[PDB]
Each structure stands twice: as structure tokens, then as C-alpha cells.
Design a protein around this ligand. Structure first.
Ligand code: CU
Ligand code: CU
Ligand code: CU
Ligand code: CU
Length: 476
């Protein structure tokens, strides 16, 4: 049979009352011909792309039609804590919450997802994620590929696994609390190995790693390069040519790739050096989508310059914050042992060369920052507003992968896991790799966040977050 076409999320803008309506609900999807219960925003799975303009406010009405509580966070958007949608931003089942977003950051591809306390991994795994397209006056002048669903397309890449009855097989247990929830099936905007018909010339892909725990590494099947034009928080100063593009959980990159007549190619993901993630079929390059060239000229450009990136400022005298990530050694050892017993040596491929003892020993609070599993009631510190700070995040002490995300900002990486950042990671980022080593970022918070609606800082390996690897902080 033919490949399904790549689903394209609807690009949503405000009504005359300046409102966007998002309904959160459950329905059915089909994978490999089997029905599964799934959750979506304005539909059964995944979500729309909300279009925002810098300097304009919009109001979002969010209707929770689930039978459990949820929250809605705008990952990558710089907004006050009151509308950030972290764990404190509860929307009761059957209820509605509205937020007004005053967009004040450069053009970028952001996304939105639940942030329910202790349950974010399950709610994302069940289907909830959407996109945010921010535009500003600067990016349209570049004449990039811009026809949504034709030469400008979002690519949300996620793994799942399913039980024999067809349902999503999600569990937060001792194994996944240590190494993450991952599966054997790869979805691309919700579809298994779709094709996308693209015109001849440049194709813009807005890539999102929407996996709970799996890192990805994009490349093309015939080794044509990818031209990175933007990261999490917006355009790079100029395109950066790469042959492969690692993408951590929750990160976005936009790339341009050439489309030539008569030569279809796949976007693929290459095996990564992360525990658990190279089990067949991920032990080999895995297709993500087929690009099918169409003999119609694409009008988009790849300009030599994209934007102006300001210099880093002097670092002397800035507040330095230490964030020590950690995992309880016993539950790290027990979850890694369960991974190895289940899959054997292949669970470490590509890597470098039972009774109840009480609540003190519960894996649900085994992962921590600065010695503390996430306490919704006690922000760990008060950060300055309108001030640059240097945050130092260490994963020394274990070897798991921790893509560390800070709400309320787009930062600059100074050191990524002990090395200067790669050029395409040197611009605006909301995520930094921490793995066995130390990262340092330069952050500034432009908006307030009070104790009652604090900003989160956390590992974006969702099962780590849900079992304590998160802190709250206030601003202002
Ligand atoms: Cu976020
Ligand atoms: Cu996030
Ligand atoms: Cu982590
Ligand atoms: Cu978050």
C-alpha cells in the first residue's frame, strides 16, 4: 500500500473576539490498523498550531473535557507565571480556564503540552501536544518557505508502544522512573512513516522531539545536508549546515532541505547513545517520513543572514545558581537492572566502554534537584527579574540523559555538558543537555512569577520530572 500523507496540524488564529478555543478530550486513533484511546487538543490526537504575533495579545479559552485534571503549558513562550500553565495551573475536569498571552519575543516554533503534577509523562504519552508558531516583523522579510503544509511543515516526532489489545501501554514504574518511557513505534504528526509531497527547491521542516524520554538524531537517507535556520527560541544569525541534527526531548529546530525532481528521500533518525534507545528497530537508522518531490517550483529562499544575535555580556558579578540533579542510587540501579534483564546487552548498545520499606523508599520521589524531590508548595529560590543570571546544572553522579528546561525564558548556553555549544545550539535555547557532566546557561526572566504560580525548572525526560526532578522558582 502507499504511505499515508503527513498530517498537517491546522494553523489557528484568533476570532473577532480575539479568542482561540482549545478543547482537551479523549477519542480514538488508529495505529497499524488497531484502534486506541488517545487524547488531543481540538481532536483525538496531538493538536493544532496556534499562530501568535509579537506585540499582540490573544486570549485562549481552554476547555478540559477529560475526566481528570490537567494543565496547559506553552513550552518556549516567555509569559508571566500566572499563565505559564505549570503544575499549579489546574483546569478541573469539565471546566474551562482562559489565559491572555501578551507575546513579546522573536519569531520561533514553540509548542504546548500538559504539566499535570506527577502525570505529565502519561498525559503526553496519551496524545496531548500542540504547536505554537510565533511570527514577528523581521522573519517575514526573509522570504523563507512559508506555505503551511506545502513547503513549511511541522514534524512532531514521537515514539509509543502499545499493548496487544491496541491500547497505548504507558507506565510510570521503577524502570521508567530511571530510564524513561520509550517504545518501538515511531509516529510523525501521529502517523506511522508518512510521505510529504514537497515542491522543488527549499523545504522548511519545523522539527519537534515530542518523545517522553527518547533523544533523536535527524539526517537524510541520501546524506543531503540540513540547513539549520532556528532553534528553540528563534532564528540563528545565519544558517548552519549539518549532516546530522541531535534533538533532545522538547527541543525544536527549523531546517531547510533541498527537494530535487525525481529523487525521493527519507528524513531518518540515527541510533543514539542513550540507554534503552537502540533496541530494534532503533538499533539502525529509522525512517521518519518520505519526502516526495513535486515538479512545481517552491518560492522560498535560504538567505545568507537571518538575524542579529547579541553578544554575550560580561559574566563577572552575575548571580551564579547551582542546580545539582540527582537520582536515588538504589532506584537508578534497580531500574537499570530491570532494563538489562528485559532487553539484555542491546539496552547499552552504543554506550561508552523487593519488599515494601515504606514511603522513604518510594520511587515516586526518587529523582531530585539540590537534594529535594519537587515540592509544589515551596519554590526553591527567588530569581531576579530583568537581570542576567548564570545557572549551573550538574548531572555528575549518574549517567542518565537530562535535557534541562527552564520555564519563562529563552537563554544562551555557555557550556553544554562541559563543552562550548555547537554553532546551531549557540543561539536562543530553552533546553540544555546535562549528562554525567555540567552545563551553564545565561538566563534572564522578563516576567513575574509568584509562589502560587511559580516557574518550573526541570529535566524534560518526563518520567524523571514526574518522580521529582523539578523545582519551582519565583521571579519578582
Ligand atoms: Cu516550558
Ligand atoms: Cu516542556
Ligand atoms: Cu533527567
Ligand atoms: Cu516544563
Amino acid at each position: 500500500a502507499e504511505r499515508p500523507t503527513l498530517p498537517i496540524p491546522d494553523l489557528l488564529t484568533t476570532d473577532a473576539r480575539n479568542r482561540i478555543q482549545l478543547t482537551i478530550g479523549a477519542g480514538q486513533s488508529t495505529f497499524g490498523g488497531k484502534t486506541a484511546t488517545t487524547w488531543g487538543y481540538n481532536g483525538n490526537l496531538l493538536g493544532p498550531a496556534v499562530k501568535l504575533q509579537r506585540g499582540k495579545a490573544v486570549t485562549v479559552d481552554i476547555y478540559n473535557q477529560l475526566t481528570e485534571e490537567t494543565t496547559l503549558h506553552w513550552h518556549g513562550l516567555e509569559v508571566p507565571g500566572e499563565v505559564d500553565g505549570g503544575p499549579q495551573g489546574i483546569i478541573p475536569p469539565g471546566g474551562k480556564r482562559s489565559v491572555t498571552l501578551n507575546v513579546d519575543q522573536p519569531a520561533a516554533t514553540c509548542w504546548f503540552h500538559p504539566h499535570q503534577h506527577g502525570k505529565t509523562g502519561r498525559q503526553v504519552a496519551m496524545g496531548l501536544a500542540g504547536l505554537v508558531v510565533i511570527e514577528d516583523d523581521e522573519i517575514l522579510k526573509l522570504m523563507l518557505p512559508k506555505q503551511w503544509g506545502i513547503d513549511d511543515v511541522p514534524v512532531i516526532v514521537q515514539d509509543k508502544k502499545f499493548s496487544a489489545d491496541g491500547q497505548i501501554d504507558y507506565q510510570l514504574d521503577v524502570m521508567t522512573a530511571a530510564v524513561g518511557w520509550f517504545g518501538d513505534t515511531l509516529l510523525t504528526n501521529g502517523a506511522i512513516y508518512p510521505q510529504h509531497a514537497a515542491p522543488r527547491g527549499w523545504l522548511r521542516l519545523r522539527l519537534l522531539n515530542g518523545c517522553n524520554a527518547r533523544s533523536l538524531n535527524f539526517a537524510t537517507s541520501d546524506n543531503r545536508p540540513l540547513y539549520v535556520i532556528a532553534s528553540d527560541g528563534g532564528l540563528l544569525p545565519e544558517p548552519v549546515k549539518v549532516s546530522e541534527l541531535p534533538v533532545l526531548m522538547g527541543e525544536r529546530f527549523e531546517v531547510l532541505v533541498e527537494v530535487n525532481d525525481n529523487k525521493p528521500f527519507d528524513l531518518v533518525t540515527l541510533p543514539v547513545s542513550q540507554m534503552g534507545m537502540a533496541i530494534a528497530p532503533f538499533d539502525k537508522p529509522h525512517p521518519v517520513m518520505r519526502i516526495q518531490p513535486i515538479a512545481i517550483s517552491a518560492s522560498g529562499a535560504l538567505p545568507d543572514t537571518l538575524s542579529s544575535l547579541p553578544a554575550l555580556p560580561s559574566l563577572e558579578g552575575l548571580t551564579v545558581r547551582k542546580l545539582q540533579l540527582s537520582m536515588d542510587p538504589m532506584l537508578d540501579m534497580m531500574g537499570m537492572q530491570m532494563l538489562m534483564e528485559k532487553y539484555g546487552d542491546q539496552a547499552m548498545a552504543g554506550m561508552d566502554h523487593h519488599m515494601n520499606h515504606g514511603g522513604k523508599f518510594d520511587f515516586h520521589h526518587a529523582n531530585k534537584i539540590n537534594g529535594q524531590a519537587f515540592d509544589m508548595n515551596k519554590p526553591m529560590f527567588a530569581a531576579a527579574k530583568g537581570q542576567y543570571e548564570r545557572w549551573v546544572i550538574s548531572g555528575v553522579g549518574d549517567m542518565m540523559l537530562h535535557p534541562f528546561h527552564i520555564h519563562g525564558t529563552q537563554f544562551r548556553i555557555l557550556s553544554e555538558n562541559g563543552k562550548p555549544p555547537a554553532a546551531h545550539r549557540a543561539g536562543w535555547k530553552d533546553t540544555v543537555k546535562v549528562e554525567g557532566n555540567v552545563s551553564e546557561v545565561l538566563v534572564k526572566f522578563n516576567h513575574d512569577a509568584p509562589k502560587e504560580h511559580a516557574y518550573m525548572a526541570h529535566c524534560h525526560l518526563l518520567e524523571h520530572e514526574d518522580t521529582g526532578m523539578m523545582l519551582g522558582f519565583t521571579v519578582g
